[PDB]
Design a binder for this molecule. Structure first.
Ligand SMILES: *[C@@H]1O[C@H](CO)[C@@H](O[C@@H]2O[C@H](CO)[C@@H](O)[C@H](O)[C@H]2NC(C)=O)[C@H](O)[C@H]1NC(C)=O
Ligand SMILES: *[C@@H]1O[C@H](CO)[C@@H](O)[C@H](O)[C@H]1NC(C)=O
Ligand SMILES: *[C@@H]1O[C@H](CO)[C@@H](O)[C@H](O)[C@H]1NC(C)=O
Lengths: 49, 50
């Protein structure tokens, strides 16, 4: 015999913050020998980028 | 493609001043030496080690 106009809130996530990292700076930094040693590993951090 | 970096040139400030000589000859050229069970310990600090 009666009706109620109810209101509800529904929350869904949309997206997260984009994060960009680099192999050379994060792993060791400015070491040239570290870069030379990492160059022999291949393109792992290129694939990560 | 890559990252941007700034090249370095040269240092800024030195170590503590080094103008002495570490007496390494006290433990190297000694008149008498000690035994294995009771050796001698000499603390060497605040000097230049060669
Ligand atoms: C259906 O329900 C609503 C409330 O959910 C009723 O509205 C109330 O009516 C009384 C008397 O008419 C008022 O004193 C209230 O202030 C009203 N409430 C609101 C929120 O407006 C309504 O009367 C009901 N319908 C029937 C046919 O009984
Ligand atoms: C050298 O050492 C002395 C004390 O050992 C210090 O006072 C002084 O600042 C140092 N540097 C120079 C350039 O004299
Ligand atoms: C003897 O002492 C001198 C300085 O006192 C030192 O230069 C030298 O190494 C020591 N040993 C020998 C075998 O000369």
């Amino acid at each position: 015999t009666n009706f109620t106009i109810s209101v509800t809130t529904e929350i869904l996530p949309v997206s997260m913050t984009k994060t960009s990292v680099d192999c050379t700076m994060y792993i060791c930094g400015d070491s040239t020998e570290c870069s030379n040693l990492l160059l022999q590993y291949g393109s792992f951090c290129t694939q990560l980028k | 493609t890559s990252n941007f970096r700034v090249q370095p040139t040269e240092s800024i400030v030195r170590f503590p001043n080094i103008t002495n000589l570490c007496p390494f000859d006290e433990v190297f050229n000694a008149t008498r030496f000690a035994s294995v069970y009771a050796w001698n310990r000499k603390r060497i600090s605040n000097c230049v080690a060669d």
